[PDB]
UniProtKB/Swiss-Prot annotation:
Zn(2+) 1 binds at C50, C52, C110, H112. The active site is at H15 (for protease 2a activity), D33 (for protease 2a activity), C104 (for protease 2a activity). Cysteine protease that cleaves viral polyprotein and specific host proteins. It is responsible for the autocatalytic cleavage between the P1 and P2 regions, which is the first cleavage occurring in the polyprotein. Also cleaves the host translation initiation factor EIF4G1, in order to shut down the capped cellular mRNA translation. Inhibits the host nucleus-cytoplasm protein and RNA trafficking by cleaving host members of the nuclear pores. Counteracts stress granule formation probably by antagonizing its assembly or promoting its dissassembly. It comes from the Viruses. It comes from Coxsackievirus A16 (strain G-10). This is Protease 2A. Homodimer. It catalyses: Selective cleavage of Tyr-|-Gly bond in the picornavirus polyprotein.
Amino acid sequence: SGAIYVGNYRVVNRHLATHNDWANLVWEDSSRDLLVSSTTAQGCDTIARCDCQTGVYYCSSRRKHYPVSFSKPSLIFVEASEYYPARYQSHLMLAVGHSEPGDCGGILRCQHGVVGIVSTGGNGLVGFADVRDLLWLDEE
Ligand SMILES: CSc1ccccc1CC(=O)N1CCC[C@H]2C(=O)NC[C@H]21
Ligand SMILES: [Zn+2]
């Protein structure tokens, strides 16, 4: 589990969104595994606006933050899981690292801010849904 809290937005994995998220929906995209809902309180996270390929992510199944090198956002075939059939996720970045399903939501960050959230994994790879192209998270 986990979310990004920027401005009056809450960014979560679409597959982990709650009824309150869906009842206060701003935007969702199943191909990216992302959903954004509105919040009453303002958040403290800042979104990175960059092309970094190195950063640090939180792994809840290890209670640890790990430094990683990750790929540029791309269209990756991802194997079937409990929440999705086997399909080609978009805007996904891969790194070598440990993950189990409940680590979805952990933040990946660089020197500029939040880069994305854990979305997939398997065989020692972890997959992050990028948010750096969602410029509208910075306003309104
Ligand atoms: C961070 S999500 C994760 C991490 C480690 C293991 C599994 C998951 C998610 C998950 O349920 N599956 C099904 C089993 C095969 C895996 C794969 O290659 N793609 C999806 C993935
Ligand atoms: Zn950066």
